[PDB]
Write an enzyme that holds these catalytic residues in place. Structure first.
Site, mmCIF file in Angstrom:
data_model
loop_
_atom_site.group_PDB
_atom_site.id
_atom_site.type_symbol
_atom_site.label_atom_id
_atom_site.label_comp_id
_atom_site.label_asym_id
_atom_site.label_seq_id
_atom_site.Cartn_x
_atom_site.Cartn_y
_atom_site.Cartn_z
ATOM 1 N N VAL A 1 1.106 -1.214 -0.045
ATOM 2 C CA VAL A 1 0.068 0.052 -0.027
ATOM 3 C C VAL A 1 0.992 1.388 -0.125
ATOM 4 O O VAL A 1 2.130 1.164 0.365
ATOM 5 C CB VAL A 1 -0.824 0.173 1.279
ATOM 6 C CG1 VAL A 1 -1.931 1.484 1.197
ATOM 7 C CG2 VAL A 1 -1.642 -1.127 1.275
ATOM 8 N N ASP B 1 2.959 15.169 10.473
ATOM 9 C CA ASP B 1 2.677 14.909 8.894
ATOM 10 C C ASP B 1 1.174 14.843 8.735
ATOM 11 O O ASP B 1 0.614 13.902 7.943
ATOM 12 C CB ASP B 1 3.344 13.641 8.814
ATOM 13 C CG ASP B 1 3.524 13.613 6.986
ATOM 14 O OD1 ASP B 1 3.084 14.823 6.412
ATOM 15 O OD2 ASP B 1 4.217 12.771 6.533
#
Ligand SMILES: Cc1c[nH]nc1[C@H]1CCCN(c2ccc3ncnc(N)c3n2)C1
Ligand SMILES: [Mg+2]
Lengths: 275, 297
Positions: free
Chosen positions: A16, A129
Site C-alpha cells: 500500500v 505529518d
C-alpha cells in the site's frame, strides 16, 4: 521482553498504497483473518518505541497499535496496526465528482482529525505529518490518523506550516503542536478544492513561498462564513497567535454540527458507492 | 520496435521477468531480441497520461553512448477503466550494481583515488554527451551510476530529458533527498526561483566524488530539512581527510563552485589533471573487473 518472528501471526497480503507510503502492507492476522497495516523496516530499544506508540494510539481517532515483530536474516522489524479499509481522505476527494466534498462532510472529518490531534497534544506528542494521505476512513466512516511522530528524504511540503521551514530568520525551524493545526486547515482546503493550496507550484517553489505568502484562502465564495473563519484560524500565519486544538474544537464550524447522524450515513453510503 | 516520441503498449515489445510486488525497478526482456532490460513501473492516472504525452514533446534527442544506460522508451500497460495504468520506463540492464554498492562493498567504505578518478571521468563523459545535446541529468549520485558485468560505468537514464520518472506518480510531489543538490536548485531567501542548469550536474558530480572517497555525501549527519537549509549557505564542502592528493582536492574544488555561473563546464572538467592524467587507467579497469567478479561469487 523479546519480540517474536511474525510467521504464523501476521502475513503480508499486498503493498500500500501500491507505492505511496513506501514499505507499508495490507496484512492479515493469521489466526483470525482480521486485516492489519504493516510497516516493514530493515533494522539492527524498539520495545520502548512500540510501547509508546501503544499508549498513545488508544483513541477512537487514531489507528490503534497492535504490536511489533522481528523477522531474522539485515533483520526485519514489522510494525503492526489496525487496518483502515476505506482509504484516505485524499482518495475520497479524488473519487468524488467535481473533486469536492459537502461542507458538512468537511466539518465532520475536520472535527475527528482535531479530536485525534487533541489526544496526542495533551500527551505532548506532535503528529508532524497531517495531510489527506494520513487521514484514513473505515467502512463505518470512522476517521483515524496514522503516521504520527531512515529520514533521508523530504516528503511533500504542501501541508507544512511556515515555522517548520528553515530560513534566515528561522534557521532552527520549529515543530510546535500548532503546526498540526495549520496542516489541518490545509487538509480542509484539500477536501474543499480537491488539492492543497500551491498544488500548481513545483514542490521546491512551494517550500520557498509558504513562509512568505499570506495565509491561503478558499478559492470560492460559495462557502459559509463559518467555513472561511475555520480556515482563517487553522491558517494563522504566525504560530504564536494560532489557536490551540481546544480552541478550534469550539469553533462554530466544528462545534455546531446539527446534521451529524445524516452526515455519517451519507459518508458511509458514499464510501459504498465509491468503492 | 523502439519509438521515443510515442507512448505505446508494451505487450509485444517488453515483458517483466520478475514478479512485481510494489517506481520500483524490475528485471525485464525485449520480446523480440531477448536482451534484458531494467523496467521502472509506476502507477499513473489518466490525467498523468496526458501530462506524459506533453512531456514527450519536450524530449530532446540524443544517441546511445557507452557511459549512459540507454533509455529505450515509455510504455503503458493498461488496467480496467476503474483502475490506474502502469507507466513503464525501460532502460538497458546493468548487472553489477551501483557505485554506492561498490563503496559499501569495499573494505572501509572508501575507494582508492585512482578508482575515483576513473569513475569520475566516465561520469563526466556521460554528462558531456547529455550536455552537448542540451539535456540535464538532474540526479547524479552514487546510486544513479551503474556498473555492467564488464566494469563499464553508465549513468541511469529512464528518460532524463523528459524527467518522466520524476514528474508524475504519487511521489512527484516529494522534495526528495537534498544531499547531492547544487545550491541553485534549492529555493532560498536569495534564490526565489530554482535554476536548473547543466552545471548543476557538475556540482552533483563533485558530491559523488566525496561519496566515493568517504562513503557518504557531506552533511549526512544532518536531518534532510537542515541540510537543505545549509547547502546554499555553507561554503563549498570539502574532504575531511588530508591524505588525498592536491589534484583531487583541486577536482573537488572545481566541481563545488557555489555560484553555478562561475562553475566550469563538463568539457573544462574533463581537462582537469585529476581526470585528464590517469597513468594506471588500464590497471584500474582490471581491478574493478576483478572486484566485480569477486563480489559476484
Ligand atoms: C503501518 C504502520 C506502522 N507504523 N506506522 C505505519 C504507517 C506507515 C505510514 C502509513 N500508515 C498507513 C497507510 C495506509 C494505511 N492503509 C490502511 N490502514 C492503515 N492503518 C494504513 N496506515 C501506516
Ligand atoms: Mg485507536
Amino acid at each position: 521482553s523479546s519480540l517474536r518472528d511474525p510467521a504464523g501471526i501476521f502475513e503480508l497480503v499486498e503493498v500500500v498504497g501500491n507505492g505511496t507510503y513506501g514499505q507499508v502492507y495490507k496484512g492479515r492476522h493469521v489466526k483470525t483473518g482480521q486485516l492489519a497495516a504493516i510497516k516493514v523496516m530493515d533494522v539492527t530499544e524498539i520495545k520502548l518505541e512500540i510501547n509508546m506508540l501503544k499508549k498513545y494510539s488508544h483513541h477512537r481517532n487514531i489507528a490503534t497499535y497492535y504490536g511489533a515483530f522481528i523477522k531474522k536474516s539485515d533483520d526485519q522489524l514489522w510494525l503492526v496496526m489496525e487496518f483502515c479499509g476505506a482509504g484516505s481522505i485524499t482518495d475520497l476527494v479524488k473519487n468524488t465528482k467535481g473533486n469536492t466534498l459537502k461542507e458538512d462532510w468537511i466539518a465532520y472529518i475536520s472535527r475527528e482529525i482535531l479530536r485525534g490531534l487533541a489526544h496526542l497534544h495533551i500527551h505532548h506528542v506532535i503528529h508532524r505529518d497531517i495531510k489527506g494521505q494520513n487521514v484514513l476512513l473505515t467502512e463505518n466512516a470512522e476517521v483515524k490518523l496514522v503516521d504520527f511522530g531512515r529520514n533521508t528524504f523530504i516528503g511533500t511540503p504542501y501541508w507544512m506550516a511556515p515555522e517548520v521551514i528553515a530560513c534566515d530568520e528561522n534557521p532552527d525551524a520549529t515543530y510546535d503542536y500548532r503546526s498540526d493545526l495549520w496542516s489541518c486547515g490545509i487538509t480542509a482546503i484539500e477536501m474543499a478544492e480537491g488539492a492543497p493550496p500551491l498544488c500548481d507550484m513545483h514542490p521546491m517553489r512551494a517550500l520557498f513561498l509558504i513562509p512568505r505568502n499570506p495565509p491561503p484562502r478558499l478559492k470560492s465564495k460559495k462557502w459559509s462564513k463559518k467555513f472561511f473563519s475555520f480556515i482563517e484560524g487553522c491558517l494563522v500565519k504566525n504560530y504564536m497567535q494560532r489557536p490551540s486544538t481546544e480552541q478550534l474544537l469550539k469553533h462554530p464550524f466544528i462545534r455546531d454540527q446539527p446534521n451529524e447522524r445524516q452526515v455519517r450515513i451519507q459518508l458511509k453510503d458514499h464510501i459504498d458507492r465509491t468503492r
